């Protein structure tokens, strides 16, 4: 417990804003939409299946 006070590790999310989509960080709406569209249509289905 003393070590946890000195060196806590990531254990859980803040449930209000846990993570942000990476294409929010994109330079450009065309790229960002392409990433979102591919994420929605292809990658997230595959990973949820995987």
């Amino acid at each position: 417990v003393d070590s946890v006070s000195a060196s806590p590790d990531f254990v859980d999310f803040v449930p209000t804003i846990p993570m942000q989509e990476i294409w929010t960080l994109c330079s450009s709406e065309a790229q960002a939409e392409a990433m979102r569209k591919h994420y929605d249509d292809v990658w997230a289905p595959a990973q949820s299946e995987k």
Binding site: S3, S7, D9, F10
Partner: protein
């Protein structure tokens, strides 16, 4: 190089113990007598198995 803290431990212990015991005993006894006015006979038999 990206280094992430990951301080963690896991423990597992499985143990099984078994005893089996079987025991058998067998005893047998026979006694015989024979009689005639001028003869006497005796027989004994004893058997033990463990």
């Amino acid at each position: 190089v990206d280094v992430q803290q990951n301080d963690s431990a896991t423990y597992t212990n499985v143990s099984g113990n078994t005893i089996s015991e079987y025991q058998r005993s067998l005893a047998t006894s026979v006694a015989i007598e024979g009689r005639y006015n001028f003869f006497s006979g005796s027989l004994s038999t004893d058997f033990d198995s463990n």
